[PDB]
Ligand binder design. Structure first.
Ligand SMILES: NC(=O)C1=CN([C@@H]2O[C@H](COP(=O)(O)OP(=O)(O)OC[C@H]3O[C@@H](n4cnc5c(N)ncnc54)[C@H](OP(=O)(O)O)[C@@H]3O)[C@@H](O)[C@H]2O)C=CC1
Ligand SMILES: NC(=O)C1=CN([C@@H]2O[C@H](COP(=O)(O)OP(=O)(O)OC[C@H]3O[C@@H](n4cnc5c(N)ncnc54)[C@H](OP(=O)(O)O)[C@@H]3O)[C@@H](O)[C@H]2O)C=CC1
Ligand SMILES: NC(=O)C1=CN([C@@H]2O[C@H](COP(=O)(O)OP(=O)(O)OC[C@H]3O[C@@H](n4cnc5c(N)ncnc54)[C@H](OP(=O)(O)O)[C@@H]3O)[C@@H](O)[C@H]2O)C=CC1
Ligand SMILES: [Mg+2]
Ligand SMILES: [Mg+2]
Lengths: 362, 367
């Protein structure tokens, strides 16, 4: 009954969304976008009988049987043509900002699983949300949890974090870590807690929260996905298994609850500790960058470069936060971006500077 | 500004409500009821400058400075005169059923802190509710918690229980326990927590308040007493409400809803949360729920038998294990009773059950 477009269908969230569609009825998939993974894309288009494809990268997809949009405006033009009830925005990276803006324009509901859009261009997304009235539901497990318990008056919003792959390591050994010791961008971002820094900025945008009302706790066990501390002593917490199909399903079928597998209650350990500034320096850059979309966009651009460089073996793990920090210095005093073009300009300039810094660090 | 009547103002919930009104602005207390505690009633009247009082016991209240109602209809009379924005119904015992019904007739919101009204006459309350459209918000901390996270497609509604004073006791030792074992909240509530009859009442109240089938309710013993309620969703999500064990929290919530009052925020630390199924051998009276849930006759007799048995325990007439036996045997005498249809039908069952439970209690007391 409800029509769906999945942007970034070939990624993790994209394929987990497909899995949900196999498990629950009522949504018809009518289009996808994907970047370069044609082998998986072909498999999707075959299994789901998808007649509309937007290609965002540099590959071919002939098929006279299906409509194929191609180029820098493929997502936007596909969406205009299809006017889906629901768009799952699961594109990775900075291209997520235009993907989200276009989905808000042409869709009745947007399921948001791209972080860059809010980190770099949250003001643009909020402006478009207000103009269009489109429903927006976060897919991120922590924002999904908060969405389910949020109210207008809160003391604090608590986001939880694993602490990443090196949460147990000594401060002294972390600097030297290799991909082998860490392992995927998301995986590296969890280890530096840059992913958690993105989530704080996203929560500020989604829930109109001041920076001061957000708390991050390392939560070893992975059960509590968010909590809301209220003025009266009450705390509303959300617990679930750590499976992204849960918040995917919630954003897709809201206000209905999909029957998956209930989390029946048993005795549990719930630990909450403050992140160590000496272990997670890039995370603690939040206070420096929060008020500036120029700084936030530069923060994201430098992290993209540094993670890629870390993965390629050009720098050690300790080099990530240093690339970010050094790149941010070069954007101090930048005026607040006002348009999409301003944001895209900062982004590309930040990528250039971060690469220069990465070269120095080796 | 909102006007408030507190029915049962001299009791535990009553005084905790008064404490909230001292800490928080926006609600004016214009009327109280009390049963017999004149000392406390007069000092409430003096400290809150209350001009309106209903007496429900056979007591004298000398005052020309203020309006005083007396006799069997004093609550209904005062409420009809005052028409408060909010009535807190904190009367103890069976007379809460009449009180809640009169409160729904003359208030815009009822804050419900009386269990007998829903246990015994929930069908009567639900009918009056849809007639008037009055708001009813539960004050009980478990129901308050569930109220905060409830949604139509819950898989399970989870109520938590301390397990009460004898929770760590061997089953053989439980039968012979004495008041001193249970009492070292209030006396009745403490016993009911020990037998888990208080939880049986809360399950029945949850079914009424939230329109849940009995099969959708689970009760877990929760040693830490941090989680006050949870809902399990069909998708894997579970929404839990945590707070300090302070009744002022849910009292404030019900009075001020949709506003949250600033009290003391609970900040998160490392916690263990335990959830265990109650042992039917340890809490026999709690597991009578499946037998009584569909009958307001059996639920009224359940409540009445409990009232008699708890008092008899506290008076030293029977040991702790005699409480569930008084309840079980009294219920046996009401097997097959027809479903009550009116307030009057309910009150008749209550009276019969009290008298029948008294006889059983004698029997068990004589051994
Ligand atoms: N993974 C998770 O558990 C979570 C992810 N998110 C957010 O979701 C977003 C995507 O996550 P994830 O699914 O893991 O990422 P993946 O890399 O696993 O997949 C993302 C998709 O985006 C496509 N893509 C890549 N580059 C571009 C581009 N330049 N333009 C348009 N599309 C492109 C990829 O295509 P292809 O494979 O063909 O090259 C793929 O289809 C991120 O912002 C992430 O932070 C949020 C919460 C949880
Ligand atoms: O092997 P199966 O025959 O077991 O298919 C399993 C599931 O995939 C679902 N599915 C296939 N295509 C789509 C689509 N385009 N949109 C939503 N669900 C889809 C099927 O739904 P269906 O058979 O209803 O298309 C079915 O529920
Ligand atoms: N206490 C708690 O923590 C909780 C209590 N509840 C429920 O709230 C209700 C009352 O609670 P609680 O305040 O603790 O009880 P209390 O015994 O502390 O107070 C009961 C109040 O009702 C009055 N009263 C006594 N008998 C009668 C009667 N026959 N007719 C009219 N009024 C009478 C009493 O007046 P007086 O003092 O003059 O005799 C007193 O003001 C009960 O249903 C209880 O289960 C629910 C959740 C939590
Ligand atoms: Mg997350
Ligand atoms: Mg309770």
């Amino acid at each position: 009954e409800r029509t769906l477009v999945i942007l970034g269908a070939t990624g993790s969230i994209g394929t987990q969304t497909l899995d949900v569609l196999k498990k629950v009825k009522g949504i018809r998939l009518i289009g996808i976008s994907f970047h370069s993974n044609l082998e998986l894309a072909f498999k999707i288009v075959k299994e789901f009988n998808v007649k509309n494809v937007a290609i965002t990268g540099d590959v071919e997809f002939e098929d006279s049987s299906i409509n194929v949009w191609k180029g820098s405006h493929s997502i936007e033009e596909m969406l205009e043509a299809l006017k889906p009830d629901i768009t799952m925005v699961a594109v990775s990276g900075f291209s997520g900002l235009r993907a989200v803006l276009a989905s808000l324009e042409h869709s009745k509901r947007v399921c948001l699983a791209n972080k860059e859009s809010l980190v770099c261009g949250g003001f643009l997304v909020k402006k478009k949300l207000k103009e269009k009235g489109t429903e927006l539901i976060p897919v991120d497990s922590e924002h999904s949890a908060i969405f389910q318990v949020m109210e207008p008056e809160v003391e604090k919003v608590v986001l939880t974090a694993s602490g990443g792959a090196l949460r147990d390591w000594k401060i002294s050994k972390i600097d030297r870590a290799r991909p082998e010791d860490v392992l995927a961008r998301i995986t590296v971002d969890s280890a530096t807690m840059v992913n958690k820094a993105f989530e704080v900025l996203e929560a500020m945008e989604l829930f109109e929260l001041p920076f001061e009302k957000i708390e991050v706790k390392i939560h070893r066990e992975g059960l509590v996905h968010g909590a809301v501390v209220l003025p009266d002593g009450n705390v509303k917490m959300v617990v679930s298994p750590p499976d992204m199909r849960i918040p995917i399903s919630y954003a897709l079928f809201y206000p209905r609850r999909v029957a998956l597998e209930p989390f029946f209650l048993r005795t549990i350990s719930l630990s909450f500790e403050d992140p160590d500034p000496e272990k997670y320096p890039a995370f603690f850059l939040l206070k420096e960058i929060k008020d500036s979309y120029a700084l936030r966009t530069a923060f994201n651009a430098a992290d993209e470069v540094a993670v890629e460089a870390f993965l390629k073996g050009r720098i050690r793990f300790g080099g990530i936060h240093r690339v970010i920090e050094k790149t941010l210095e070069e954007f101090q005093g930048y005026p607040q971006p006002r348009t999409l073009d301003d944001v895209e300009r900062i982004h590309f300039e930040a990528i250039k500077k971060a690469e220069r810094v990465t070269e120095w660090l080796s």
